[PDB]
Design a protein around this ligand. Structure first.
Ligand SMILES: COc1ccc(C[C@H]2C(=O)Nc3ccccc3C(=O)N2C)cc1
Ligand SMILES: COc1ccc(C[C@H]2C(=O)Nc3ccccc3C(=O)N2C)cc1
Ligand SMILES: O=C(O)CCC(=O)C(=O)O
Ligand SMILES: O=C(O)CCC(=O)C(=O)O
Ligand code: NI
Ligand code: NI
Lengths: 288, 288
């Protein structure tokens, strides 16, 4: 059977979204440079080491779904200069997202998280994303363009034996889910900096860590239309951090008003006809 | 033909949502007391007098749809004690919204606005709400439960001659929109404090002001599932105002995390497994 299409972030930029739209998945080789991966890893390191189990009893909003051997840390902007500067302003990411979401309008970050899987982390069941947070998405017509997409960026090697993600190609177009089987999957074998791009309808799962020694880490960036509420909030991010960002990054984090693609769009998160950023006199690109 | 069903806010509470679900519209008599209407009117008065045309050239997010004789002012919490206290904690509103949105989960305010129509304001074309802000809603399956509803609360008399709202009963279930005609409408004749309740699929329009003397005013409260982004932002509302609110009102204004109805819900606007309100040590019901 056919493998996940592989594309250049440098040369094949216009081909990436059409490839995902057709096949449900694509690998973007060198989506992030090794320099960015390195800085990103350094910056998030301590925060993933301190992270408790997904369903820690201390938590207000425990995640009862992820395995106990998963450490997920979101709201990365205050943690990581590399994230808030380099990845939030990624030319490749923005071309793909504008290609993907043009029918709907503005898009933003639903969740940017670093996920680290401990050695011996088990395979997840095959699933579609968004079903534990956005029940609305299940009620969309089958030809509705994808309302969110997920960049699964390797921050360490993804191998068959260490739990590289499985996808079922074409499954983003499936309505009958009885052919759902691990027999139908292929793997996203990836180097650090490569990214697996899927839609919210692509059937996929984390793989089984079978070595007992390897710790796999990824940066998962769920980008979605600005009409859907983010899984994560940047409301508590300090204003000096927000004001150091580009206007585009501020929009991505919910620190700007948003626009739909309707011809006479009336906007989202507006304040009596004016934007958040105008109203609050929000500055941009102020060095820290 | 049949008129809009009329219901008591006091006695018929459990019947209101079932009535709207069936007919697409209902009138809730005395939804707000005359005392609340009075205080609300006093408090918003100056702000509607200062409001420029919907598409004022000074505006970041001009509304090119509403007539030039419309004054709409949203983000009412900092303007009105009556709004932020009495209407945001309305027992009737919350019973209806929990009835309406239980399949999806938490709901919040998409927009709370005072609309005032000048004398001679023309009839709006027949329409469904949400199409200039949430293109996603058009892609929902026809049996998808309503994802937003709109309380059109009379703040002055609604009469046939002064432009009382038109609705087409049953039109929330229409898929073919070729029977759309003013011939198919009935009017929401209402006293101050009464409310017309419609869904996002109910076909309706503002009426023609034919007297040349009467100024009609309403409070429009679009309540929607917390998975959809509000038309308006409360990000710039001062913290002392927010901290004077009940926890429920804070949630309604986007100053709290939110939950979906998925069995193992992972939540919306969360911060690494904890809520906004826990993270920011947000107080509630602190008198000003
Ligand atoms: C163990 O079995 C699972 C079943 C389903 C899921 C889906 C997933 C989701 O819908 N969104 C994301 C996206 C990025 C990172 C994590 C998640 C996340 O928490 N869940 C639950 C995860 C695990
Ligand atoms: C003049 O013709 C019109 C055509 C359509 C509309 C729809 C409406 C909407 O979708 N949502 C609301 C809801 C509450 C108050 C105002 C509005 C608002 O601005 N529009 C555009 C209004 C006017
Ligand atoms: O671990 C992976 O590679 C996939 C994780 C995933 O799909 C999820 O948690 O939603
Ligand atoms: O003026 C009215 O009564 C209805 C207004 C309305 O439906 C709208 O502006 O969306
Ligand atoms: Ni997943
Ligand atoms: Ni309307």
């Amino acid at each position: 059977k056919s493998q996940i299409p592989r594309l250049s972030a440098i040369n094949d930029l216009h081909k990436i979204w059409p490839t995902v739209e057709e096949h449900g998945a694509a690998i973007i080789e060198s989506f992030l440079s090794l320099d960015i991966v390195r800085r990103l890893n350094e910056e998030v390191d301590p925060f993933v080491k301190i992270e408790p189990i997904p369903a820690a009893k201390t938590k207000d909003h425990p995640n009862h779904v992820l395995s106990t051997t998963t450490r997920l840390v979101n709201v990365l902007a205050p943690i990581s200069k590399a994230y808030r500067e380099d990845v939030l302003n990624s030319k490749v990411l923005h071309r793909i997202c504008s290609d993907a979401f043009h029918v709907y309008g503005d898009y933003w970050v639903l969740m940017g998280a670093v996920m680290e899987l401990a050695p011996s982390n088990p395979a997840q069941p095959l699933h579609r994303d968004m079903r534990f947070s956005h029940p609305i998405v299940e009620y969309l017509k089958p030809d509705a363009p994808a309302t969110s997409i997920n960049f699964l960026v390797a921050l360490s090697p993804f191998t068959a034996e260490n739990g590289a993600t499985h996808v079922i190609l074409g499954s983003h177009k499936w309505q009958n889910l009885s052919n759902v089987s691990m027999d139908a999957t292929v793997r996203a074998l990836m180097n650090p900096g490569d990214a697996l791009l899927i839609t919210d309808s692509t059937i996929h799962c984390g793989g089984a860590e079978t070595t007992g020694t390897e710790t796999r880490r990824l940066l998962t960036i769920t980008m979605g239309i600005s009409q859907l509420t983010p899984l994560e909030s940047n409301l508590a991010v300090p204003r000096p951090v927000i004001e150091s960002l580009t206007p585009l990054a501020q929009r991505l984090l919910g620190w700007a008003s948003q626009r739909s693609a309707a011809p006479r769009d009336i906007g989202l998160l507006t304040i009596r006809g004016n934007s958040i950023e105008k109203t609050m006199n929000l500055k941009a690109e102020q060095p820290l």
